Amino acid sequence: GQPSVLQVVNLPIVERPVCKDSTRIRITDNMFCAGYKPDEGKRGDACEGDSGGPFVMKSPFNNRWYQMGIVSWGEGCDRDGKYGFYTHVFRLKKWIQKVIDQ
Amino acid sequence: ADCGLRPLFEKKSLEDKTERELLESYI
Amino acid sequence: IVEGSDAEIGMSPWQVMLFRKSPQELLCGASLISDRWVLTAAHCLLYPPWDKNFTENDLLVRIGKHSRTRYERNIEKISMLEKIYIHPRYNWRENLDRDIALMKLKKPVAFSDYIHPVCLPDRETAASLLQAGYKGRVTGWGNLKET
Amino acid sequence: DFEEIPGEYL
Ligand SMILES: Cc1cccc(C(=O)c2ccnc(NCc3ccc(C(=N)N)cc3)c2)c1
Ligand code: NA
Numbered sequence: 023g024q025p026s027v028l029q030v031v032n033l034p035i036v037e038r039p040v041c042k043d044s045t046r047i048r049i050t051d052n053m054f055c056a057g058y059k060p061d062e063g064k065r066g067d068a069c070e071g072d073s074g075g076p077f078v079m080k081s082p083f084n085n086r087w088y089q090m091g092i093v094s095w096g097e098g099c100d101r102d103g104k105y106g107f108y109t110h111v112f113r114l115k116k117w118i119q120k121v122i123d124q
Numbered sequence: 125a126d127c128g129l130r131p132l133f134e135k136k137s138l139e140d141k142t143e144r145e146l147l148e149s150y151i
Numbered sequence: 152i153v154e155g156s157d158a159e160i161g162m163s164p165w166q167v168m169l170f171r172k173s174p175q176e177l178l179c180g181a182s183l184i185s186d187r188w189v190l191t192a193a194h195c196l197l198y199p200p201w202d203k204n205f206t207e208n209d210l211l212v213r214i215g216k217h218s219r220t221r222y223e224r225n226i227e228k229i230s231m232l233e234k235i236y237i238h239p240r241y242n243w244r245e246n247l248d249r250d251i252a253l254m255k256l257k258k259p260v261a262f263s264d265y266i267h268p269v270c271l272p273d274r275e276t277a278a279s280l281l282q283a284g285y286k287g288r289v290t291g292w293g294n295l296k297e298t
Numbered sequence: 299d300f301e302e303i304p305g306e307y308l
Contacts, residue, residue, distance in 0.1 A: 023295060024177075024299070027217050028166060030290045031155035032145045037283040050248040056287060065154040071293020072152060074169060074191035075180025076269060079280045079287045080146050086128030088276055089165075089182055089269045092192050093289060094250045099297040100153040106289070109192065109250045112277035114238065121236050121253045122188065127184075127270035131263070132161030140162050142288075149286035172308070175300050211307060221301045229307045 024071070031066040033057055036105050044104050045097060052110045054091060060102030068106045069099035077108045152291050160217055163290045164267035168213035169195055170229075171205075178205070180291045183214055183268050186259040189230075193241040193252040200243075207232040212254065215265040219292040226265050230256040 033056040041055035049055075056077065058064045068075070077091030091108025098104065111118075129135055133143075158166075167181035167189050179195035189212050196205050215227040234255040242248040260266060272280070 024219060025152075025157070025292065025295050026219055028158040028163065028219070028290055028292055029152035029155040029295070030142070030158045030162065030288060031152050032142055032286045032288050034149060034284050034286045035282065048246045050246065052249050054281065056289075067153045068289050068291060069153050069294045069297065071177060071179070072289065072291030073179045073293070074182075074195045075289065075291045075293075076163075076165060076182040076190075077287050077289050078163075078165075078269060079285070080143055081128070081276055081280065082147055082150055084128075085134055086270050087130070087165075088128060088272045088280065089184070089190070090272055090277065090281055090287060092182075092190065092251055093180060093291065094192050094194070095247050099294065107247075110281075111190075111251075112272040112274070112281070114249060114251050115271065117238060117251070118190075118253065118271065122185075125268070125270070126262075127268045129267070130161060130164050131265075131267060132164075140159055141156075146286050146288060149284065150280075151284075170303075175303065177300070211303075220299050222303045229303065231307070 033066055041105055052113045053107050054110055055105035055107050057105035065100050067096060067100040068093045152289065152293065153295060158290060161264055164265055165269035166290055168216055170211040170213045172209055172211060177292055181212060184271060185268055187256050189254040189256060191252050191254060192250045193237045194243060194247055194250055196235060196252050197237055198243055207235055214260055228260050228266060230260055233257045
């Protein structure tokens with residue numbers, strides 16, 4: 023159903039053409055996908071309600087957490103050969119800067 | 125900016141139960 | 152999240168909840184990026200096929216949370232939105248390209264053990280961390296199952 | 299299932 027406390031999952035980023043090939047939806051450069059390949063056998067995904075949350079990575083050079091993606095879309099949750107899609111935060115950094123100056 | 129450093133983890137030099145999975149992946 | 156764990160306390164201090172005023176309930180996740188700026192997916196605000204079309208006065212952001220349902224007194228801070236922004240080239244019609252929105256809070260949030268901003272990537276951190284097979288972490292209070 | 303939140307938040 024819903025959980026009673028915040029949930030967490032680590033997920034590997036997936037190669038661009040595997041992303042493209044998992045779906046009929048046209049994939050852009052302001053998107054990446056993530057998830058386990060069907061073989062890999064580890065499951066995990068974002069789902070309805072998780073939209074807008076952070077996809078974060080911990081920098082091994084400075085020990086700081088970075089937000090690389092925004093939880094965006096998927097075709098159902100946790101299906102094989104399918105992947106979660108994320109807004110490429112860095113590709114959209116100029117806009118983010120623009121909005122913050124004012 | 126103190127961004128990215130968590131008061132209960134990095135600033136106390138603790139690790140969470142799984143952050144190490146992330147660092148491993150940078151193989 | 153499907154097939155994850157309970158987060159630990161303080162594990163994700165930038166995690167934000169978009170919370171509906173109208174019928175009080177979870178809309179979406181979001182993330183704290185400074186003392187006044189919260190980031191989210193544009194489709195949480197505007198998605199016409201689904202009548203999702205939210206303004207400032209429809210929304211609270213809830214920062215510092217662990218529990219999905221309870222009002223975490225003494226731990227969470229609830230803010231109000233001064234200004235919402237949605238990418239001008241946000242493609243809700245086709246493929247959700249540029250699915251991003253910035254939310255500006257009325258009053259600054261005070262940081263704490265449970266509330267603290269994430270960094271945003273520079274070209275170089277993106278350049279080296281954004282690669283196939285490197286793992287990342289997702290967090291939320293969304294469905295555990297599809298349905 | 300969402301616990302009532304303080305009224306002060308309008
Ligand atoms: C036509 C079309 C295009 C793009 C995505 C979809 C979706 O099914 C969709 C549409 C709007 N919002 C969604 N968000 C919730 C969600 C669902 C799944 C995942 C995921 N499976 N990783 C993450 C967030 C999905 C449909
Ligand atoms: Na999947």
